[PDB]
Assembly symmetry: D3
Homo-oligomer: 294 residues x 6
């Protein structure tokens, strides 16, 4: 008797209708405006009572507005007596830490967002490649942390002639688990960069990290990879935020291409950068939603 109701806010209209087309359904009717004083207004237009409802919004643009907007729609479908409300958040906001010498720091912002999603009334969360997977434990809720790697792997094979050889390098220490894993799915060798010194060593170098925001490191990392004798250097990321200086710096850096997936709207930045190519994840999320709905 519950049928899937699919919503979307203001954050990523394109991805949302893409998964709608993968599921065979239309987006639900909802009007999100902002009042003159900047208070977010969300009014549902469809009946969602007794339905399994999925609200898709990524933490990308004006996030605080997108996040507040998301919470308002979650609380709105919960007060409306829906059987279930699922937050589909491709890019989870506040996942990073801006961090000591003697102890760590509770991730107060990431756990604060978990608590607000929980109190708003969420009953399921679907997200992709979190900055730290242990954020699933910031919740007493099921959290699907889907990996984009198959997407990354197939894209390489399919797109890069030289993949069979090549080398995967991480721009940082913390990503090493990430390169390693991707490397051995290709039965391939690895190297890593640390702020600049490089470890490991005429191959197609491909830097892999979870997200790319200001992009400074990965550009200086590319400059060192070509100084270490690399044929080409690629940059493949899950979340492409490209804030500030980023696109200008990608405009002054020598990438064959920089690949990301569409957890974040990029078209308007594609128009300013010929490098960027985007992988479609409509089916992973689409498929994950359908799985959750049985």
């Amino acid at each position: 008797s519950p049928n899937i109701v699919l919503f979307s806010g203001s954050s990523h209209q394109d991805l949302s209708q893409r998964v709608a087309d993968r599921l065979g359904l239309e987006l639900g009717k909802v009007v999100t405006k902002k009042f003159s004083n900047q208070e977010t207004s969300v009014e549902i237009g469809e009946s969602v009572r007794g339905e399994d409802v999925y609200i898709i919004q990524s933490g990308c643009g004006e996030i605080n507005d997108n996040l507040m907007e998301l919470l308002i729609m979650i609380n709105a479908c919960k007060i409306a007596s829906s059987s279930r409300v699922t937050a589909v958040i491709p890019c989870f906001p506040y996942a990073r830490q801006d961090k000591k010498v003697g102890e760590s720091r509770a991730p107060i912002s990431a756990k604060l967002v978990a608590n607000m999603l929980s109190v708003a009334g969420a009953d399921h969360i679907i997200t992709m490649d979190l900055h730290a997977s242990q954020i699933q434990g910031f919740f007493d809720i099921p959290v699907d942390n889907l990996y984009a790697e198959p997407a990354v792997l197939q894209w390489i094979r399919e797109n890069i002639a030289e993949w069979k050889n090549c080398i995967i390098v991480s721009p940082d220490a913390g990503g090493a688990k990430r390169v390693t894993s991707i490397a051995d799915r290709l039965n391939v060798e690895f190297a890593l960069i640390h702020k600049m010194v490089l470890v490991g060593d005429d191959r197609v170098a491909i830097l892999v990290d979870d997200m790319a925001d200001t992009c400074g490191t990965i550009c200086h990392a590319a400059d060192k990879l070509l100084s270490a004798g690399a044929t080409k250097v690629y940059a493949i990321l899950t979340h492409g935020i490209f804030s500030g200086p980023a696109i200008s710096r990608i405009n002054n850096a020598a990438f064959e291409a920089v690949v990301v997936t569409n957890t974040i709207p990029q078209e308007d930045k594609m128009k300013h950068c010929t490098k960027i190519q985007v992988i479609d994840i409509s089916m992973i999320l689409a498929e994950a939603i359908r799985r959750t709905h049985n």
Copy 2:
């Protein structure tokens, strides 16, 4: 040995300092900045262990930015082992809101829960749009009133106050407007939009529209025009929270007001630059007393 601690956000720094002056202390060092990707950042610069923390943040300007900042700073003081954390919210956001049934305040309630989930232990605000918002929490809430200062201003700035009339621009501020009447021994009038109709007698008397907030300001401008059509000598507009967004200031500039009075729960210095008819009432003392009281 808790000591009072005053932290200010990005919303209303002048007001924060102003109550700090009233309490005789310094403000707590905190740097609030947004990251390149516009995520809010907060880094407290002092120790708050065993302290009575007070963060002064009004619901104004960039609302979701300001509230999210407030929540991050509250959490940061609770994970830091504060004795208590009190959110001072001069103008509470989202306070505002079918045949056959009523809607639920679902945003106000949502912010209540987000402040509670962040770790707030006490709330100090002023003039809630509905006093029952105190019940959206399970923690003490000191919904303060600006009337004392409004009656004082009225007596001391309107010559003919003994023979004025307090008018409510709507059908919901009635108990707010009779309150004033009873305290000035003056009558009130009520306006309804049905073409606006007025109930009451205004001919040859000074009319004073009073409400809690003014945002787009259309109802009070049209209300002034009718009150003058009913023969009112002068029109005042007295508001606790002066949001003044949109086309409002243009409207009061074209409006037949003698003056419009608001409180400093929201920054108004910028708006008076563009509007000579606005005047503000300091409520830094009201919040100051509420803090002192709550601190014991």
Copy 3:
């Protein structure tokens, strides 16, 4: 396939059956009783497993006995593994507050919020109610609360029972009832008026001021409830001395406690009309002015709606 079970408390049985009659079902077997030491006893007599339970009980009578009786059968249907328990509370208890000037600030609504938390902790999953004293009480919960209006019923009673309703005036007994009266006024496309008692001071006389004109019109005072009924009786007196042909009083909740019935028998009203969120039969037997408006359609349709669309 979750089914639907209607339970009645003690407070208003008649309305429970009327909602049963409108839903096409009969009432679920439950025995409610007072022990010798006046301890509430609730034994439900039919299976509620996997069922959609609705318990109908109004905040009237011995308020605390009915409220505890309601909480116990909620927690009894909740421990017995029902799929959902909806508390249908036609008149919500503790909705008003005994404040009075607390100047410089307001007082927290401690009783209404405490009853909200007790309904929540008892195990309620949904709330239905009719005309809350303040709609923001919906926000005192974390579960869906439906506050229905009786306005449609008041408007149809008014059109079918008051001869010159076209030229009436809708009056509020107080400030704070202005929105309600205006609403009703615009709906009948008639105008409104307001009455404000000034607070007596040391050496005055009590006075009510009327803002608005009622001369030569049928006056209709409407508020959310009537309990002690002094304000509306003096309101009828003042409306008639302002030149009103008649005075009615139409409330959604008719509490009638203390001297109310004695006061209406001696007041100047044409009628005092209320809804059946509270049993009124034994009151009309002592007061011929009370008339009743049935609202079992609204509660019945809200129940049917809350079950399967």
Copy 4:
């Protein structure tokens, strides 16, 4: 540091001021009435901010008005920013259960647990009560619960008031109070016995069984409370037909509902002794057999102990 402000609800004012007298304090300014429509009103008259509040209300009279009155007063002192609120409930309401059989399972204590959850949600932080019908009720909370015993005062009354207490017999009126009597028995260095009324079957006659010997001995039945009192009256008669010189009854909680007074006026008790967890003043004016033990010192010290 917080002081102690102590408040009395309507139910047992006399005992609250006895506890006040024991603590060297006076009761706090509070007005508790009823509105016309029977809603409870609680308005605190003094400041409780940063103080240690203790509210004494017993489970008696009109119980749901008193329980409601207790909860409203707790959440009123909690929202007023009290340092800590403690509910002193000498006789805890809804403690017993009307199960009166389950054959392959037991029933849940729905009412006692629900009252535990309402005290918790209202804002209670500590509970102090006396002789719970089941000690396990302490586990119905996530806050401390002090379930104090009246046994010292009962032993004291027995020694100073039963002439032949040295060879007295402690009797339990039921199977469940056995552990109770045992306790008392070994403390007086005397023996016990049990009364058990069997299920009346159709066509059988009312049959009560006595286990133990009470011949030529003073019998004293002992149970956590007394409410309608039928089982203990018949227990008296059975004990006397079994050759007991005298029968006493000592209960911690004297409810005395319904027909009890009349029952006891026609019962062959020498004395029915209870504690003052419930007002008894007006009952002794209709029953000369009722005698009260004061338990002010136990609650008084439990409070002083909780405050430090």
Copy 5:
């Protein structure tokens, strides 16, 4: 439409399968082990989405590993989006309190309620258990708790195995099993007696078969001395019937040397290895009771 899913833990494989058999099912695939560093590991082998899962685990053997295993498995099926997770706990752990009793008040059951809160936070939605040491433990949760009785099967065992049963006497080993003894006694229309500790006796056993009844039997001292006293009071025979037979250290050695006719327990706790050294122990099977309870809550 959710189907019944039954899982079994380390504690009682036999009885688990045994209820699986009375239900017409097989257990679900679960693998359990303990890592080299002694940490409990659970890996469910089936999908439990949308399922009505039942986990059977008794408070026996090594209890903290069994209980923890139980909590990971509940807080494993619950996160896997099961329709509902039910803990089937035949013998509830930590149900008793170390009765070191302060003279003027009582002690709260801190361990039983602690076990209650950990089962609740793990994600349990229902609990099925048998003869709790105190029934009010049902009140340690805000979720439905089924406290099933073995007394039907005990009464039937008694009538069908003790020849002289119409004139026996139900006895209790202390002052807390009195209600229980009373209960079966009236069901059998038979008088009763109780022992309180010098050990004394209240009641008459002369020339009767005496049967000790209580919920659990552990180090067994009380029931052995109770047997000795009952025979000293002129009893023909002494039996001991309980629900949960824990039989910890010195117990087996104690009853082997005790004047018991037989000692009866249920299979809420595994015994067979205890029957290997003890010929007086006999087991009453209660798989039906749990089966009935599972099926009824599942509807």
Copy 6:
């Protein structure tokens, strides 16, 4: 003013009294035993009312028992009306995982979050722990959690114990300790390399190699790692860990491994294992915990 009260369990008697000495006080009276049926028993011997109590129990030994007893101790303290209860857990149990290679998604920390929720419901108000396998476990609570580092004491142990440390090389088995090796390395302005299965990237030829990671259990990875590190030229190989677990066949392995010393901290009882393995050396962290306890007590 609340005094500070200290309790210890069965897990680490040695450590607990050391922090007691550093704080200038003695340990609290508590008898912990296990009933005949294996039911942990706790009985507090001293009044904790209105006091600030700290209970130290490590996820060492037989963990389920010590953790269950820890919970009993914390809840014994909460209903005894203690001013506050803080769980001092030097080595957090169930911190680790076995999720691995689910293709396309992670497995949630079901176990560590479960221990968090169990510590929270038991009544804990603060946690003091050291070197969590993942710092994000701090976020598994809503209460302050101090995840202290042992890195100061390891840096000073080396700087005073390895002669060839100005030019050393710091390394681990699989990358995952990278959020780690870097940190130790740059605090000495030193290069580094990492091992991943078996290959190694970086070069340590003719230099002292130093494996560092969080906890050692089985130890296979680090022994094979030590051997390969020689296969590439290091002068000597050391192994520096914080928690010294050494379960299963670890000690036989290290006795057969070519370490010049394997160094751990005393978050876990070591003495029994030092009598069987001469390569073990212990760094004492009682001061760090002492500072954290003292600092939260104000």
